[PDB]
Amino acid sequence: PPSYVAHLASDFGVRVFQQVAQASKDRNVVFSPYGVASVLAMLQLTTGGETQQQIQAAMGFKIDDKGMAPALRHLYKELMGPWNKDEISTTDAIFVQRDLKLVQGFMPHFFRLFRSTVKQVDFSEVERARFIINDWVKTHTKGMISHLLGTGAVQQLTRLVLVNALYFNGQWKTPFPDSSTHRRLFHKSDGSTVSVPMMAQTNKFNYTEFTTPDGHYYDILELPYHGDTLSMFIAAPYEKEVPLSALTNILSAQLISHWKGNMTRLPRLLVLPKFSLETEVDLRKPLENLGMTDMFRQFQADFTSLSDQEPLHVALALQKVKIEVNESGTVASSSAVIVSARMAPEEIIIDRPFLFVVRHNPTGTVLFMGQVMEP
Numbered sequence: 001p002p003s004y005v006a007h008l009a010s011d012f013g014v015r016v017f018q019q020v021a022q023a024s025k026d027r028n029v030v031f032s033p034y035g036v037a038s039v040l041a042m043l044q045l046t047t048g049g050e051t052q053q054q055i056q057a058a059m060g061f062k063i064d065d066k067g068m069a070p071a072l073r074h075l076y077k078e079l080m081g082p083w084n085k086d087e088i089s090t091t092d093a094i095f096v097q098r099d100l101k102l103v104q105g106f107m108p109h110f111f112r113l114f115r116s117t118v119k120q121v122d123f124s125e126v127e128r129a130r131f132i133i134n135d136w137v138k139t140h141t142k143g144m145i146s147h148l149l150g151t152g153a154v155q156q157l158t159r160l161v162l163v164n165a166l167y168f169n170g171q172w173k174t175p176f177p178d179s180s181t182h183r184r185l186f187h188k189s190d191g192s193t194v195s196v197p198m199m200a201q202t203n204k205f206n207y208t209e210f211t212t213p214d215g216h217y218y219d220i221l222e223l224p225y226h227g228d229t230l231s232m233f234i235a236a237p238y239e240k241e242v243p244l245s246a247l248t249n250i251l252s253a254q255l256i257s258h259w260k261g262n263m264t265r266l267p268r269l270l271v272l273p274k275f276s277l278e279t280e281v282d283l284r285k286p287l288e289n290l291g292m293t294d295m296f297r298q299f300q301a302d303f304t305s306l307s308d309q310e311p312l313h314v315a316l317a318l319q320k321v322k323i324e325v326n327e328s329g330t331v332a333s334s335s336a337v338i339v340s341a342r343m344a345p346e347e348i349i350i351d352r353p354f355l356f357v358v359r360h361n362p363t364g365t366v367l368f369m370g371q372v373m374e375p
């Protein structure tokens with residue numbers, strides 16, 4: 001089902017973000033809970049045996065089950081509809097050795113389910129294979145993501161690669177002014193500060209203070225995008241010794257929903273750092289920690305649904321996310337005569353590390369999720 005599978009998909013991907021985050025420590029990290037959910041669902045089809053059970057358990061749904069793929073493909077068409085003014089461009093690709101004898105009916109079946117095809121390449125032509133892979137991403141992310149560092153691992157022994165790449169760029173329901181954007185010190189998690197550019201805006205924001213069962217307090221602010229189709233939620237720790245990991249490690253779609261129910265509109269002056277960050281992840285370590293170890297093993301991996309004669313296994317599972325946040329009419333050239341604005345009761349300055357979550361409002365899909373430590 002629709003919002004059902006979107007939630008199983010989002011939750012799984014967040015579970016994947018927790019792993020990437022517990023590894024990144026104090027590095028800025030952008031990730032797409034949706035992306036890794038979309039691709040892993042496709043890979044379910046190329047698996048069999050234990051390698052398949054480990055993934056359907058990790059994700060929480062069999063891709064061949066009634067309404068799973070139909071709901072998933074309906075979702076994709078929704079995100080890529082006409083409202084999306086090139087705000088989010090994505091691409092999911094599975095590259096297998098072309099010389100490999102495939103199972104009778106895998107390609108036809110895969111297409112019917114995803115309306116996409118598994119890519120074939122002759123991995124013996126290393127240079128060609130890598131170019132072909134970094135090129136697919138390019139042409140299919142509207143030229144936003146044209147390279148990968150991980151492809152540098154594709155060699156002769158490679159027979160299978162998984163790739164996922166997303167690009168996201170706002171377009172707020174109410175653009176942050178421009179003349180208001182200014183310099184402001186940001187408190188990095190070590191007492192050190194840096195003069196970073198921040199956007200400012202007074203208006204009626206949807207806010208809520210949030211406490212985790214653990215007792216951590218966060219200022220939660222929802223920031224809508226044009227048409228309320230998307231919303232970027234901001235979870236900024238209360239004091240200063242409050243980590244992001246206290247929230248991100250208990251995060252789910254039901255938690256975002258929770259914020260919405262307790263949310264209220266207060267007239268504040270929001271000061272938000274403008275950030276354009278990029279992260280590339282080697283999904284292997286994080287996927288293994290979620291219980292998916294077999295797929296990465298030379299003798300254990302079981303992809304007999306993609307081909308039954310083979311010593312296969314994913315040689316490279318990765319993701320690349322490019323997130324940008326600005327005024328949306330961002331001249332950005334380092335600042336005329338006047339600047340006016342309506343006054344607000346209080347201000348909410350985001351000058352310390354914080355985490356954000358972008359969601360598809362109609363379905364509550366957790367599209368993007370990050371931890372911004374130093375903009």
Ligand SMILES: [Cl-]
Pocket residue numbers: 144145146147148
């Ligand atoms: Cl790139």
